[PDB]
């Protein structure tokens, strides 16, 4: 992926981090295992105003070195090839060939 | 579909527009680049120019449209036939 796409991604996460507390509490109001009527509706409208990016569903997992949006792995971070690369040269602590 | 416990979702920009329109009896088409909203009882009889991707299709909200979203009434693909 291009450098620009990585720049857009870090902006998405940064905006979500700043409003993380507000989103957590606001959604709590909208539920409370069945809550109010008007209060609930106002909370919904507030979330709308609230910058889209701030939503944690607006982030795409990308390689921390290249930004590839596909083939990501939570564990080991990196990406498909990137894992290998580090593991292959001997930077990953423990990976090797599996012959079970 | 959307959960019943959360009620209907409407965009505030469109929502603000209809408020002004109803208190003044405006008949001009409502310009909107959004389709995620739902049809409200207070928009009955208005004409809304719903974007489809390149242009805004005017849709006249009727009584039977209550409860549906704006998106179901704005086809996005232009398809005539394969022959």
């Amino acid at each position: 992926a291009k450098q620009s796409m990585k720049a857009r991604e870090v902006k998405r996460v940064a905006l979500a981090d700043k409003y993380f507390a507000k989103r957590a509490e606001l959604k709590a109001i909208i539920s409370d295992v069945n809550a109010s009527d008007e209060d609930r509706w106002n909370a919904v409208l507030k979330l709308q105003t609230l910058p889209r990016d701030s939503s944690p569903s607006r982030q795409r997992n990308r390689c921390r070195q290249t930004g590839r949006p596909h083939g990501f792995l939570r564990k080991f971070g990196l990406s498909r090839i990137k894992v290998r690369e580090a593991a292959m040269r001997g930077e990953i602590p423990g990976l090797k060939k599996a012959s079970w | 579909p959307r959960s019943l416990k959360k009620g209907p979702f409407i965009d505030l920009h469109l929502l603000k527009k209809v408020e002004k329109a109803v208190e003044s009896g405006d008949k001009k088409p409502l310009r909107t680049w959004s389709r995620r909203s739902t049809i409200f009882p207070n928009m009955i009889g208005l004409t809304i120019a719903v974007h489809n991707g390149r242009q805004h299709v005017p849709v006249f909200v009727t009584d039977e449209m209550v409860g549906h979203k704006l998106g179901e009434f704005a086809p996005t693909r232009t398809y005539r036939g394969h022959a």
């Binding site: 009527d37 008007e38 106002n42 | 009620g7 209907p8 009882p41 009584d63 039977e64 409860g67």
Partner: peptide, 14 residues
Amino acid sequence: GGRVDRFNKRFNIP
């Protein structure tokens, strides 16, 4: 009908 009647009862109407 019902399109509005349904909306009325189903949603709290805030």
